[PDB]
Structures are given as structure tokens and as C-alpha cells.
């Protein structure tokens, strides 16, 4: 099998790669992390 614990750092880079929000419901917008819960912020696909 395989195991790894340093993955914690790696994922950071990925999330560090990306602020623009995207409408998912209508209206809720995902994204805007630095701007209302973890899933989303209280036409679909609009930026």
C-alpha cells in the first residue's frame, strides 16, 4: 500500500493557487473566502 502525511502542505499550494465568486443557487455564491457559511455566501454560473 501507500501512505503519506506531508499531503497537508501540498493541498495548501493548490488552494493557494487561487477573489471571484460563482453563483450556484437563485442567491448563493460560492467563493469569496475573504469576504454566509463554509459552503457558500448567502442566474446560475454567473461570476
Amino acid at each position: 500500500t501507500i501512505s503519506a502525511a506531508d499531503i497537508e502542505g501540498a493541498i495548501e499550494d493548490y488552494v493557494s493557487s487561487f477573489e471571484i465568486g460563482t453563483v450556484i443557487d437563485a442567491a448563493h455564491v460560492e467563493g469569496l473566502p475573504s469576504v454566509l457559511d463554509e459552503h457558500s455566501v448567502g442566474e446560475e454560473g454567473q461570476q
Binding site: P33, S34, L36, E38
Partner: peptide, 17 residues
């Protein structure tokens, strides 16, 4: 940090700060 609050160790979920 705050989620809506998150602490290191329901599930500690008792933004980004």
C-alpha cells in the same frame, strides 16, 4: 478559525479567521 467556529482537535465546527 471561524467558519460561519472551527478549532483543532460537533467535529469542532462550534470566515478564515
Amino acid at each position: 478559525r471561524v467558519v460561519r467556529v472551527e478549532f483543532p482537535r460537533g467535529d469542532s465546527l462550534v470566515r478564515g479567521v
